[PDB]
């Protein structure tokens, strides 16, 4: 039984990137998936994102730019604080200048850089590098 669409979509993207495909189709989807893809595209890891209106909830076709070295959804969705962002940073990312964590906050889903800029915390979602 399908449980987490976010982890499903992220691992599908990782499998397509490992196979060196140009585009990955993501079904089922939700707004969390859309905002995560938006953050990835903003940081350049994911290319163009096309919506498809099939009757069964919608699909996302994502273009891959050869930029991902490893992707994945942090599960469980740990509540993290602004002072606690840095240890999760070192836990999931290589190098202090490489990669980003994705966080869901009360002002919306953003990267760990934007969360540290806003001086907020939230729920960890995924990592990219």
């Amino acid at each position: 039984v399908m449980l987490d669409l976010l982890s499903n979509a992220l691992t599908a993207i990782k499998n397509a990137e490992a196979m060196g495909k140009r585009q990955v189709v993501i079904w089922p989807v939700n707004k969390l998936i859309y905002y995560t893809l938006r953050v990835l595209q903003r940081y350049g890891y994911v290319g163009e994102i096309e919506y498809i209106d099939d009757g069964r909830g919608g699909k996302y076709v994502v273009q891959l730019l050869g930029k991902i070295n490893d992707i994945g959804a942090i599960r469980p969705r740990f509540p993290v604080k602004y002072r606690e962002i840095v240890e999760w940073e070192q836990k999931y990312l290589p190098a202090r200048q490489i990669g980003i964590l994705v966080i869901s906050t009360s002002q919306g889903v953003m990267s760990h850089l934007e969360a540290k800029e806003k001086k907020i915390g939230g729920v960890l979602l995924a990592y990219v590098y």
């Binding site: 209106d53 099939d54 009757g55 069964r56």
Partner: protein, 149 residues
């Protein structure tokens, strides 16, 4: 069985992504509702009524034309099933299996099928009690539920 089945099939109908009224349809929504109530009074269950509308009358789907569901239409037009259709079907299946098991007491495959059917009945009763579609005091007693067969 429910768990560890040998095969896991995909058989199901693929409907249009957003169903709409057919342009070629010669039946208005009110006529659709009267046809459904006619088939209900004849005695068909809702799945069979939908198949009859699709096949004999060319009605693709009641929901786009009328905006309602088939059981909602039947409920509005004075048709109210005793129990929900799937629960009643499962109970009738269990009663038939028990009648068979009365004359064949060593049918272990039949006993396992009866256990599967009764477990399905229990899950459906839990759901219907949670959603209020059945009374919260309802209990599956096959000896007192013989009238539904």
């Amino acid at each position: 069985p429910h768990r560890s089945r040998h095969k896991k099939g995909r058989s199901s109908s693929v409907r249009p992504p957003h169903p709409t009224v057919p342009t070629w349809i010669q039946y208005t929504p009110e006529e659709v509702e009267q046809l459904a109530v006619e088939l209900a009074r004849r005695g068909f269950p809702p799945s069979q009524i939908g198949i009859i509308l699709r096949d004999q009358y060319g009605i693709p789907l009641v929901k786009p034309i009328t905006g309602k569901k088939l059981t909602k239409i039947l409920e509005e037009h004075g048709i109210k099933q005793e129990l929900p259709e799937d629960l009643l079907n499962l109970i009738r299946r269990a009663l038939r299996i028990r009648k068979h098991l009365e004359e064949h007491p060593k049918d272990m495959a039949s006993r396992r099928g009866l256990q599967l059917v009764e477990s399905k009945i229990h899950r459906l009763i839990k759901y219907y009690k949670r959603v209020g579609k059945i009374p919260q005091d309802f209990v599956y007693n096959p000896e007192a539920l013989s009238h539904l067969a």
